[PDB]
Ligand binder design. Structure first.
Ligand code: TYD
Ligand code: TYD
Ligand code: TYD
Ligand code: TYD
Ligand code: TYD
Ligand code: TYD
Lengths: 243, 243, 243, 243, 243, 243
């Protein structure tokens, strides 16, 4: 047992992929570990995608990880436009001028390669269909075929479709070891499987500055509010706050 | 994807119909885009109609757009009287003298043609009935038949009648691409569907000078108070303020 | 629509019964129109009755209108005594001498006929009972039977009794077209239905010379203080001031 | 109505019990009428009791009225001593000599009969208990049993004890028709029920010669300062001034 | 009542302990009565202690009364030194020579006995602590145990410490019947409880000869300036003036 | 108490350091005692420094006391030059000749030793900084370290800097027992703490011969003008006058 414990001790990975932007989030969760399903939820328009996108950007950019992004609602172009702006600290969607200036400027193309030029980001859309298996097959391919380290499912709103999907999702993450982040719309109880299968659930709250609350973290058990973030309307990035 | 993003970038219309009178409203909303439902709400008598009417006047007059106006509460004559006065910077309803002077003067007729002479404004009343479909059928006709660019529904007060109507309205706007502005009476929470389906919600506040608050804007997400306006009791126009 | 607007324009009555004594009140309200409910409120003993009474005197006397007065609190004699004094610019209630002198003098009788001799004023009391319908039935009779142009309800203090009554009152005024003035005791918010149903609300303020404030006027929307009046302790008439 | 108004006119009592000592007090109040509650208030030691006492003396002495005096704070002897001195224009409480001289002189007894010998004054003390009903029962007896025309409650300082008492007091005065004068200690707003129920409120002010201010008079409405009085330190009587 | 008034008349003590040195002080106050709290106030160094001390000297010396003196600020020796000098019309504190001469002369001892030899004066110090009850306990002992007729508290400067103390002091004086004189430092309004609880307030004023003003006297009500006194820099006694 | 008073009597020091030059100053103040703060004030250039300097010279020279001098405005050399001249009855600052003659003459050096040769005078400058504590620390050192009997602070002009300083100064003097003389510039009321904390305040007045007025002396209380002095323009010494 002694030797059995030792190697067990020196082989266990407690700290996963560290999050970014919110001072305190890593304290209460120790980052994202493989095989775990992170659930990021809150009200519509409260900044879920942005936050996840930001995490994705840093993971694939700085942590040198491969990130696949599967969008159920919006298209790839839309997603691509968001990441590029984000990466370039500008909000392409808000400036008809910038969009026009950047294309003839040659900056678009320069921006496109400096981001997707490598094999780091894998965006997939067209899952508009409500079939789980068709979805799981694509996810499984993104992991095995594209070697994605992190897969973000965007998005799901609160039957068995969700119950069964959440159980299939958690099964996929646990068995492969990929980090699966899922974005769910909330219109703890505010979400069965949704709460049960998810390993860590993060929720963002706003004015009614965003409050990041850790509703649940199996591994650490440390719950509560991890900290606050401030959205920069000019850059579109969520920044750590001094609240 | 590259070419897919590019054309997506150069084909997206971020700035819609710009609003008028309030310095700052366009900053936080980037105007009104087609397929979106703008909700203008506040207390009764707080200036909702005026504001919308003003927007309508400029849109159909300066922006060269076709504006249909569907009134649930008041008659066409009443509406027509308001626009004409507005257009002529006078308050017909307040001056028994002016009304009388303008008819024998020949200015009424001159005013009537210089405004409705063209096929730009389409006023429809007699929706007094509480049936949605009868209403949707007329709206759909104003868009398709009369080619209206903007449709203002005046008005609605806070069941399914509203819930279902709001969902039918948003469905009509999204699918056709028309800009639908709806005026609702409030006697964010102050309004389900009302808040959910509406893309942008503007609220006016007064003394208890009008404060224009942007309760919600999906596209931009930029919320808060856009600015202030000053009502000119002599002209009836809401003017930009220096508060 | 053109012809439809025209006649609408030449048939609309913007200026109602003009008020008297306060230079500016008509400016911000354009007088009292039929079908509207005017609410005159303020602290007890602040001069509500006097003001209304004065308006009533001029309306029935100079404007050649029929005025019915329904008193909930005081008796007809009391009211009659007030009008007569008012009409004769003397305060009968304050002079035991004058009352005695005028009866044997023959001036009482001369005063009584020169005021009530005609079918212009209709005073009704004995509504001490808290039943609305009994009240509405009498009001409706004063309008239809006695052909009263203006009906003053004196008075009401701030449930449904008031809520339902105010809604019944406004319904009676709108449908018949009579001008209903109601006096309410206040011990804008200082008053639901009270504020909602009333078309114009006038409030008098004093020393803690009377300030006439127009809390609300649907038709005109022009709010604020209309002007000041000075009470003549010798005549009992409120006079226009030079404040 | 005519005959109804007439007799109403010739049966109404406008002028009540006239006050004494202050030229002008009767002008602004027309004296004290039955069924009304007069409130006399001011700072402690400012001369409230004296003033009331003086009124009481004249009422019961010259106006041939019966005056009951109920003291909450001080004893009957004390009150009796004050009235006697007052009646005899001397300050018994200030002269150890006079008190001694008057008893052996036989003047005390002569003074006692010439004042209380008749059934005009009724002094009651021992209400030290804070119970209202016990108090109302005694008051009611002073009116009905002793036939008191005027009842002076001395005194009360500023809950429901006061709120409920004031409402019980006003109810007692209105229903019986007695004139109830109440003395309250003030340490218009300076006093709910206190201001509301009281028909006339008189306040005395001094040096920081006494100024008599009429804070409120329902019947007349005439407010303001009625005049000034000068306290005679030798006689203890408040005299009319020439300020 | 008659017999009740009589004995009341012949048992009442209007004139208390007469003051000394200022012709007129007794006129406006009739001396100090038991159960009353006399407040002597003015600017620091204006002669408060001296005046009180002088009163104390005469009371215990000529009026044959027992006087207890409780000092909060200074020591007994200091007080004793003042009284002795005062009693001997010399200022011990000002003459290093006299102090030295009197001790070897044997006059000190002769002076000490001729003043404190009897059980007339009771000086207590060491109240430096800010606790009221500890103070009240000593005062109560000076009254009951030492049978002091007059107690002088020296001194207090202007919370609840003062508010509560003043209310405890007045309660002690009223219930026991002792005359409590309190010296307060002023750096009528110049002083709540201080003004309220005190029965008589005397103030001294100087050059910016001392003016003695009677700010308040419940019993007599006679206020104003009682007269003037002249300080004898050689004897230390305040003398009556001819101003 | 007897023995307690006696020793108190024979241990008290009434007469402090006697002043010089003005016949009468000691009469009204009995000199300067330890623990007291003497304030010498008047208009700029009216002779404050001279007077104090003179006192300092005599104290340290004839009374055999140690005098520390702390200058806020001028330098040590300047001060030293003044004392030396003063000591030698000549005005060094006025004679370019004398200054030159005395240095080569050897009289400077002889003068310097015959004055500062001993450890009697301690001059400190360089307090130009507006910090109190830095100042108090030096003062405390002059007392404890240098054993100064008298400390002259020169100078201060009329917040908390002065308020707090005066309270710190008085606290330092009372607790140590040193005599602290402070010179303040006046551009009784002419000066809170300044007047309050100071034990004795002396003021000099001139022609618009110097008049010495004792504005205040706690210990003695004797106020008024102590006498007059005549400035000798040739020696620089203020001399007693025969006015
Ligand atoms: C957090 C946040 C978002 N937003 C905007 C950006 C987007 O246009 C819009 C939606 O944000 P999004 O991240 O899509 O929210 P969610 O995923 O919860 O639906 O809101 C702001 O304008 N300000 C903010 O502070
Ligand atoms: C904003 C505003 C409105 N109004 C008047 C104009 C109209 O007669 C009346 C109603 O305005 P309206 O635009 O109808 O208000 P809403 O649509 O919120 O019910 O108020 C003013 O008089 N002053 C003002 O500043
Ligand atoms: C306005 C006013 C009223 N009054 C008097 C007249 C009446 O006797 C009494 C009540 O006035 P009233 O009109 O009855 O007041 P309201 O209707 O608000 O209760 O006040 C004055 O004496 N002076 C004034 O300036
Ligand atoms: C008005 C007045 C009262 N007083 C005295 C008489 C009484 O002893 C004392 C209290 O008067 P009082 O009438 O009791 O005052 P209140 O009822 O307001 O408490 O004051 C004067 O000495 N001078 C005056 O001018
Ligand atoms: C009244 C007076 C006091 N004094 C002195 C005597 C004391 O030493 C000092 C303080 O007097 P004191 O009685 O202590 O004043 P208070 O009690 O108001 O503080 O003042 C005079 O020198 N002259 C005077 O005319
Ligand atoms: C009193 C006095 C001063 N002085 C001069 C001496 C110095 O040069 C100057 C300033 O005196 P100083 O003592 O410094 O005055 P203060 O301290 O009040 O500012 O005035 C005279 O010339 N004649 C005089 O009579």
């Amino acid at each position: 047992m002694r030797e059995r414990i030792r190697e067990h001790l020196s082989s266990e990975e407690s700290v996963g992929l560290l999050f970014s932007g919110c001072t305190g989030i890593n304290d209460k969760t120790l980052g994202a570990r493989g095989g775990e399903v992170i659930m990021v939820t809150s009200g519509s328009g409260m900044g879920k995608s942005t936050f996840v996108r930001q995490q994705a950007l840093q993971w694939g950019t700085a942590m040198g990880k491969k990130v696949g992004l599967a969008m159920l609602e919006e298209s790839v172009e839309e997603t691509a436009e968001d990441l590029i702006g984000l990466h370039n600290r500008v909000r392409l969607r808000q400036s008809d001028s910038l969009k026009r200036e950047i294309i003839e400027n040659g900056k678009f193309d320069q921006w496109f390669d400096e981001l997707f030029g490598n094999d780091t980001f894998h965006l997939y859309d067209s899952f508009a269909e409500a079939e789980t298996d068709r979805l799981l097959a694509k996810l499984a391919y993104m992991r095995s075929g594209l070697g994605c380290d992190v897969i973000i499912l965007d998005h799901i709103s609160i039957r068995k479709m969700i119950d069964n999907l959440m159980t299939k999702l958690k099964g996929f993450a646990k068995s492969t070891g990929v980090v699966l982040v899922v974005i769910c719309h909330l219109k703890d109880l505010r979400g069965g499987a949704l709460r049960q299968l998810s390993d860590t659930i993060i929720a963002l709250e706003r004015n009614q500055l965003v409050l990041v609350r850790i509703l649940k973290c199996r591994f650490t058990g440390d719950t509560g509010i991890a900290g606050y973030m401030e959205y920069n309307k000019e850059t579109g990035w969520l920044e750590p706050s001094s609240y």
